[PDB]
């Protein structure tokens, strides 16, 4: 058997309330930094989908 | 109606909607060789009188626009001679649900 | 969001419209007239863009608000620009304003009575009446005044009129009632309006001539000078004006001129800039379109960025600076100005300054607005513009997408100990992720407690928030502090400014708590549900049950998932009601299951289940309490109930089969009766020997009385064991059972392994000899199947020199090779289904059940016999890309072969097996198709994130209304029922499984409890008019279509479904009535009919549910699936994006489906295919001899040498008399043109420029990543939207909107029509050849006359019908003889009345079909083509989808696609600027002063609205009791 170099878990992250950006005033990019999980388009017309209009508010 | 053979005078042409309230429609005989209705993908479309559109508008509480749209220069629209203003009742076979009626508003 | 802090206000509607310099310099909070930024020493200076008044900076106070950086909101102010500007984005439309204008009576050049006609028709369309504008061009009377202002008053008297009538009555509000049809209507005229502006010359009005503006890329005009026509013309013309009393040109001039023209023709431009009445009555003026004044945003969005220590300026401020040094400039200018002047004479030097002073100021302005239209400097820094649209854009980027607060990610990890319908939470998670739970009386305990434990120690909590609002953070506290919080947690609040308001915890993270898992990408709504948390100590990844692998799309193989932790009850309620896993056990794509167990699960079962399983009462009573624990709530009857042992004496033992009744006794409610369901297996009765009926799953009371369970019972599996429980007891048990059989087999597989050796790959000596008898067969077939394509009798010798010859033929061409690859390939692969045949399972040494690789193989655990057949038998025939091994030039498929060898191997035909191994030629055959499959994953252009996009952006507003219609954002109809039935189809399946519901009828009974509905629903009026409507339907059954009457339509037409019974689809009414006919079986025929009637009622689709993104997802989501290649007409993603996406005119591969009679047989169809099929001179002739003899004159001896009169009298249906025709009519005249123009050619260019350079003949790293260093970058980007069109996508984008006397006289009147032919001779007794001679000039010299006929041969058509090149006769589709033609004309085909029946005439062609048959006809072909894409594919998407999707296609009458195009004609300003061209569509929307009603799911997001799908399609009133 062979161990591959690799380690997975290196983008693991958790984030309560952080720093925000002063423009948009939305949790800034940056794992190390604190930072926000995208909810993109997509994940967006999902919560549409579902009818779950609270979920996306 | 008028069924011309090959072409119409642009000059000719001016003259159709020149005498209203009554209404001329032209036809191309070879356009007429087979009926559009007759085709199977072509469903039953029925004019509503002045009644049965103010009824439809009422029981789903609709404006005219507010309704799915069929051309005042479709093929089926005309056929029956629809004009601006006038609903087409649709009955379609639906496979799914069968005989299902729809309807749409001649703009 | 605070609930402690609810808002009394909200925003209803938004108003666009421009800011006036008037209004902006009130709001002003400082004037800013300095380049510079900060003072000496740090300050900012007074005046510039840093200043105090703008807002706090630099640990000072606002000098307007007196807050700090913090509370400060920052305040707006504005520079003071020396000169007015044109606005950037109004520019196009204040230029089409001014070329529309007369300069000296200063209205447009157009006619007032036609000016006045556009602002009727305009003022009509305000208000909702279509109709009535098109009835103002009926009101009709060079022509004098008195005449045309009667046209103008008889005109103006119908509009008052038609809107005062439409007013009385509820046509039109005072407000206008707007449509996306209206909206049509008026983007047309606005358009057709601005046409007839720009096209008069000559004034209408005035018949003076205006000189000519023209325009550059950047914001300047010019005007050219008139010519001497129009110069004479004003002379002319210029006396009349007494009688009444390229150069250029400056901002004021182009002001000045519009100023006046907008006040002279104020009436149309009322209308033009308003797209409802203008009740503010607000004067349209031209300053509007100019800037005298620039705003400067608050210092609070102009902040100078922070990297680290290096602290960057602004690039706003920037450009800021730059339009205040040039402001300055013309200040001193202007200044130099005034001062002088006597001496003039050269005045072109003060208007060259004055030119140099506006084009630099405007260049700034542009700067600062849209740098795309600013001058290059020697990348610029970004204008506003660019700022709105970066990339995606700021609406796409940060309002429809966004960062979120509690939320976490990690690499998941399986997990079969965790319920189906949970996750298993790291602490690390669990200690940070917090919930703000409001401190009561009812939970004053467990908060105290959370309190006490901290934000360190679970379940805790990381901070309070008292009733005060302010917060108190627990983090920096010890144990004494936290205790004494904890005991004034429930003190009242002395404050009667917050009496009402309570404490709050910022507690931990709960096992009791709600969570969103998402796995990206989220194609459809079941990759982002509704997860239980479960805190799993000592964890460092995010654990998840293998049931939900499905859904997610996730496999773990180092995957990542976003997990998001809803911070109020109301979004906590969706997660666990709506958006919960156990909610989404069947999509609504086909409505089949997604949820099941996988793999070892499936291996378990089928030993478990297995007859030779039996058990004590101690392993019994342990496999029951392994899987149920009444403590977890896994019970019903709060005891563990246990059947009586199979086997009594002489010792008590347990079936397997026991088990399985054992865990749904426990599971399934006491107060219903058990399951019965007779259903099948994946393994067949022979595998278990001597008549067994193993394979019949039988379910009689909920006991497993018969058969094992597959991967067809508990998998994601359709009308399953899982599945009928799902049905019968709903969804909370379905998920229990899985759950509850997910522990059982892997306690199972604890106790009893399961493993795979090399005892499962080995055939016995009897097996095997089979297995080399018939592969001894095999080399025969090589050299059979190259005599039988070479055709050769006897069966020649495979060293035979003449076979050799004729498989080099075979060699050198693509067609001849294919037909011997298909043979010989076919040939083989008989040999190998003989060998699989005998071999498996008959031949194998270990057998089923033992035979564990032949056991994963049956069950659908792992595998399939196919691969089981590849390890034990042979890897067969190697095929790549539909064909054999590829051979050299040599005729050799490997250097070891010998040329043109007639063996099996040598083709790729592997007799070797993986257990035995391949030998050298056979691997390296094997390595050539094996990589095959790897080249075409990465040359795959299709992608189905573009698709989908363009479908939800589209749809999104689109849902079931509380009246069953399919209504759109806006309340315009897009159905009037939901697939005509309104049937959800996540509810549509066992909804004609009659049997299974008559089998259930008292558990189904007791399910759709009646008891508590009889009061409220119809029982009569819908069953008897159900009646009336089978009455007419069975009259008219022989009838066709278009005779069925019409007087009784549909019982869902006329009865609500959710209230009156029996108010059921036809399809569905047939169905039932057709299964108590032909089934007579304590359940009357009359009381199961009620039964069925009420199960429809209670499988309706819910008013609210999100019909449109559902469809999209139900469409893009499978698509996914196609991206594959063809193993002729277009299909997968590039046919789907023909329709949905582009909705293309001019199809790729248009074909017409003929339906052929029966009177026409099939000799007749196919000389009627002949007939038709375009022919063309090459296909008849044989051979062309040209002899050039050059005397005297070049001569030129053609002779056409044609295949025999009837042998293409039989190929092509064509006669001697019409080759005739062609040859001297057609194919003379076009090899005449043919050789004139070579003639040219030849003395143009004499030759090649020597020394003149002519055109050259023809991301990285990332091209240079494998798959595993490719998915490892995706795997941790979380997406901005669906993965991106460049591709294929990004270029079809790229498309904006000695002779007889009767042959003499036939030669002589040929040479008269033809000027170089001198003889021309035809076979018209055989028809054999053609000869003609053709004479040239002695100049002409060499010419190549044999490549000049070849090319004009295959040019030449002899017949061919337009738009029509090949009609062909397929094998007939499911019965229907069909004659399938490569081109579209309607037309044509209705003249072959005898042969085609054409009221059955299909085309692929959409638009075609559109144009001839009408838009119900298209709108049936899109549905039937939709459905084509998919079925190929064997992908099964509900036509509910599809007919959502064409009628929406549909909704104008006409065919529109999903794009910019089609969206034009759309209410939502804000959907649009969300979707592509924000800063256009903005424009847009000011300059028709829209108000956006906030009504589509884009616009309520914007501005922060609920969405209106769903939970948002009502309203919650509390009822209160006192007075
Ligand atoms: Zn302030
Ligand atoms: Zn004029």
């Known amino acids: 058997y062979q161990r591959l170099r690799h380690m997975v878990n290196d983008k693991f992250q958790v984030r309560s309330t952080g720093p925000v950006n002063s423009l948009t005033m939305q949790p800034v990019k940056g794992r190390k930094r604190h930072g926000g999980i995208r909810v993109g388009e997509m994940e967006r017309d999902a919560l549409i989908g579902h009818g779950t209009s609270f979920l996306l508010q | 109606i008028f069924v011309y053979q090959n072409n119409i005078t642009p000059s000719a042409m001016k003259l159709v909607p020149s005498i209203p309230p009554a209404t001329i429609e032209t036809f191309n005989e070879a356009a007429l060789v087979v009926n559009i209705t007759h085709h199977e993908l072509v469903p039953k479309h029925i004019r509503l009188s002045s009644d049965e559109k103010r009824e439809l508008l009422k029981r789903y509480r609709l404006k005219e626009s507010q309704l799915p749209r069929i051309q005042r220069a479709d093929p089926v629209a005309l056929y029956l001679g629809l004009k601006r203003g006038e609903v087409v009742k649709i009955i379609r076979k639906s496979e799914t649900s069968g005989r299902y009626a729809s309807y749409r508003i001649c703009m | 969001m605070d609930i402690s802090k609810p808002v009394g206000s909200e925003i209803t509607s938004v108003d666009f419209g421009i800011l006036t310099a008037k209004e902006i310099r009130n709001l002003s909070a400082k004037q800013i007239t300095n380049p510079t930024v900060l003072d000496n020493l740090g300050h900012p200076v007074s005046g510039g863009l840093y200043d105090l008044a703008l807002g706090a900076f630099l640990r000072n106070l606002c000098s307007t608000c007196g807050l700090d950086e913090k509370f400060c909101p920052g305040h707006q102010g504005h520079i003071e620009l020396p000169v007015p500007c044109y606005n950037p984005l109004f520019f196009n439309q204040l230029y089409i304003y001014l070329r529309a204008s007369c300069l000296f009576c200063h209205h447009f050049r157009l006619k007032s009575v036609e000016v006045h006609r556009y602002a009727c028709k305009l003022r009509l369309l305000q208000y909702g009446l279509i109709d009535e504008s098109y009835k103002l061009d009926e009101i009709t009377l060079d022509i004098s005044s008195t005449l045309l202002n009667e046209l103008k008053s008889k005109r103006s008297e119908y509009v008052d009129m038609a809107i005062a009538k439409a007013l009385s009555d509820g046509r039109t509000t005072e407000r206008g009632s707007f449509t996306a049809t209206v909206n049509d209507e008026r983007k047309k005229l606005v358009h057709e309006f601005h046409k007839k502006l720009l096209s008069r010359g000559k004034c209408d009005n005035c018949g003076m001539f205006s000189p000519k503006f023209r325009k550059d890329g950047f914001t300047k005009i010019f005007e050219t000078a008139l010519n001497e026509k ?142 795309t239209k600013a001058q290059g400097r020697t990348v610029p820094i970004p204008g506003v513009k660019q700022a709105l649209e970066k990339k995606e854009g700021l609406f796409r980027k940060h309002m429809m997408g966004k960062r ?174 709506l958006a919960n896993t156990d909610s989404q056990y069947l999509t609504p794509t086909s409505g089949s299951p997604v949820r099941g167990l996988i793999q070892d699960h499936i291996s378990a079962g089928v030993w478990l289940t297995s007859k030779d399983s039996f058990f004590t009462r101690e392993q019994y009573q342990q496999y029951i309490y392994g899987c149920i624990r009444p403590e977890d709530g896994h019970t019903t009857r709060s005891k563990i109930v246990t059947l009586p042992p199979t086997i009594f004496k002489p010792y008590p033992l347990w079936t397997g089969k026991q088990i399985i009744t054992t865990v749904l006794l426990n599971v399934t409610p006491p107060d219903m009766p058990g399951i019965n369901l007779i259903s099948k297996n994946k393994i067949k009765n022979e595998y278990w020997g001597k008549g067994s009926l193993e394979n019949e799953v039988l379910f009689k009371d909920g006991a497993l009385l018969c058969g094992i369970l597959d991967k067809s019972q508990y998998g994601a599996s359709k009308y399953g064991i899982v599945h009928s429980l799902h049905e019968v007891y709903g969804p909370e048990v379905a998920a229990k059972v899985l759950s509850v059989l997910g522990r059982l087999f892997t306690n199972y597989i604890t106790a009893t392994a399961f493993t795979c050796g090399m005892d499962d790959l080995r055939l016995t000596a009897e097996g095997n000899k089979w297995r080399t008898d018939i592969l001894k067969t095999s080399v025969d077939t090589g050299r059979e199947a190259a005599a039988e394509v070479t055709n050769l009798d006897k069966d020649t010798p495979a060293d035979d020199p003449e076979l050799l010859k004729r498989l080099q033929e075979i060699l050198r061409d693509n067609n001849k090779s294919g037909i011997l690859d298909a043979v010989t390939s076919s040939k083989v692969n008989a040999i190998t289904s003989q060998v699989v045949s005998k071999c498996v399972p008959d031949g194998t040494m270990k057998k089923f059940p033992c035979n564990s690789m032949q056991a994963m193989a049956l069950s659908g655990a792992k595998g399939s016999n196919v691969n089981v057949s590849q390890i034990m038998c042979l890897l067969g025939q190697q095929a790549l890309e539909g064909r054999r091994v590829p051979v050299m030039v040599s005729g050799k498929t490997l250097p ?174 047939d169905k039932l009535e057709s299964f108590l006919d032909k089934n007579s079986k304590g359940v009357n025929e009359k009381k199961f009919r009620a039964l069925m009637q009420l199960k429809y009622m209670r499988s309706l689709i819910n008013p609210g549910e999100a019909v449109g993104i559902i469809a999209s997802q139900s469409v893009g989501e499978p698509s996914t699936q196609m991206t594959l290649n063809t193993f002729n007409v277009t299909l997968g993603i590039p046919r789907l994006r023909e329709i949905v996406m582009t909705a293309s005119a001019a199809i790729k591969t248009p074909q017409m489906t003929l339906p052929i009679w029966n009177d026409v047989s099939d000799e007749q169809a196919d000389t009627f295919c002949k007939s038709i099929s375009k022919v063309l001179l090459s296909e008849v002739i044989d051979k062309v001899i040209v002899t050039e003899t050059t005397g005297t004159a070049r001569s030129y001896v053609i002779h056409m040498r044609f295949f025999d009169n009837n042998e293409y009298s039989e190929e092509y249906d064509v006669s001697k008399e019409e080759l005739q025709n062609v040859i001297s009519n057609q194919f003379i005249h076009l090899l005449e043109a043919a050789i004139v123009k070579e003639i040219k050619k030849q003395k143009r260019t004499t030759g090649p420029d020597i020394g003149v350079a002519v055109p050259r003949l023809q991301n990285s790293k990332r091209l240079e990543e494998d798959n595993d260093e490719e998915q490892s970058h995706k795997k941790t980007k979380q997406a901005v939207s669906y993965d991106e ?65 070849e090319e004009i041969c295959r040019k030449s058509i002899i017949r061919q019908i337009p738009h029509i090149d090949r009609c062909v006769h397929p094998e007939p589709e499911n019965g229907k003889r069909v004659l399938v033609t490569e081109g579209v004309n309607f037309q044509a085909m209705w003249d072959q009345e005898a042969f085609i029946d054409v009221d059955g005439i299909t085309s692929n062609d959409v638009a075609a079909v559109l144009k001839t048959y009408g838009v119900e006809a ?97 309203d919650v009133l509390a009822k209160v009791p006192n007075a």
């Open chain 3, 404 to 577: 979120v607060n509690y939320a976490a990610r990690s690499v998941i990890s399986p997990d079969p100990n965790i319920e189906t319908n949970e996750i298993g939470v790291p602490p690390v998670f669990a200690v940070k992720l917090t919930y703000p739970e409001p401190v009561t009386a009812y939970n004053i305990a467990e908060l105290r407690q959370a309190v006490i434990n901290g934000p360190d120690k679970w379940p805790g909590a990381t901070q309070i928030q008292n009733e005060d609002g302010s917060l108190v953070s627990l983090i920096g506290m010890s144990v004494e502090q936290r205790k004494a919080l904890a005991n004034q947690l429930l003190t009242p609040s002395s404050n009667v400014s917050t009496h009402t308001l309570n404490k709050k915890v910022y507690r931990h993270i709960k096992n009791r708590d709600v969570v969103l898992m998402n796995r990206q990408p989220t194609l459809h709504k079941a990759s982002m549900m509704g997860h239980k948390v479960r805190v799993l100590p000592n964890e460092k990844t995010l654990r998840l049950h293998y049931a939900n692998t499905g859904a997610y799309n996730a496999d773990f193989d180092g995957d990542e998932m976003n997990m998001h932790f809803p911070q109020n009850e109301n979004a906590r309620a969706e997660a666990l009601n």
């Open chain 3, 1285 to 1349: 069109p460049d591709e294929d996508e990004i270029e079809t984008m790229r498309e904006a909107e000695n002779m007889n006397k009767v042959q003499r006289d036939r030669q002589s009147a040929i040479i008269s029509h033809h000027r170089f032919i001198t003889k021309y001779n035809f076979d018209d007794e055989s028809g054999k050849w053609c000869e003609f001679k053709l004479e040239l000039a002695a100049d002409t010299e060499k010419l190549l006359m044999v490549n000049i006929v």
């Open chain 3, 230 to 371: 129009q110069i004479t013309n004003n002379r002319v013309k210029g006396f009349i004006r007494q009688d009444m009393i390229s150069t250029y040109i400056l901002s004021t001039e182009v002001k000045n001129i519009l100023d006046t023209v907008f006040r002279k023709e104020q009436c149309v431009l009322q209308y033009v800039f308003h797209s409802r009445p203008n009740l503010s009555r607000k004067l349209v003026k031209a300053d509007s379109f100019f800037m005298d004044v620039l705003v400067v945003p608050p210092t609070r969005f102009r902040l100078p960025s922070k990297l680290g220590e290096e602290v960057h300026e602004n690039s706003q401020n920037q450009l800021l600076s730059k339009v205040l040094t040039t402001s300055l400039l013309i200040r001193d200018l202007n200044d130099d100005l005034s001062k002088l002047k006597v001496s003039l004479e050269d005045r072109r030097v003060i208007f060259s300054r004055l030119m140099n002073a506006f084009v630099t100021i405007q260049n700034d302005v542009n700067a600062f607005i849209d740098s």
């Open chain 3, 1418 to 1514: 298209a709108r049936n072909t899109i549905v039937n083509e939709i459905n084509n894409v998919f079925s190929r594919y064997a992908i099964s998407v509900s036509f509910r989808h599809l007919d959502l999707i064409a009628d929406m296609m549909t909704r104008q009458g006409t065919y529109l696609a999903f794009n910019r195009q089609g969206m034009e004609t759309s209410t939502s300003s804000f959907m649009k600027m969300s979707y592509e061209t924000t800063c256009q569509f903005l424009t847009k929307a000011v300059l028709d002063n829209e108000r956006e009603q906030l009504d589509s799911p884009s616009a309520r997001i914007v501005v922060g609205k609920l969405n209106n799908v769903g939970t948002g399609s009502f």
């Open chain 3, 896 to 1069: 070891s072969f010998k040329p043109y060898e007639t063996d099996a191997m040598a083709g790729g035909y592997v007799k070797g097996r993986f257990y035995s191994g391949i030998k050298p030629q056979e691997y390296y055959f094997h390595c050539m198709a094996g990589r095959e499959g790897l080249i075409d994953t990465a040359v795959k252009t299709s992608r189905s994130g573009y698709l989908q996009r363009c479908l939800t952006k589209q749809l999104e507003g689109v849902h079931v209304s509380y009246d069953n219609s399919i209504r759109d954002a806006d309340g315009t109809l897009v159905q009037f029922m939901y697939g005509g039935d309104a049937i959800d189809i996540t509810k549509e399946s066992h909804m004609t499984q009659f049997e299974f519901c008559l089998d259930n009828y008292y558990a189904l009974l007791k399910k759709y409890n009646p008891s508590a509905l009889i009061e409220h629903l119809d029982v009569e009026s819908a069953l008897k008019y159900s009646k009336k409507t089978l009455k007419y339907r069975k009259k008219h059954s022989k009838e066709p279509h278009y005779k069925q009457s019409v007087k009784y339509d549909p019982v869902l037409a006329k009865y609500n479904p959710a209230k009156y019974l029996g108010s059921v689809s036809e399809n569905f009414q």
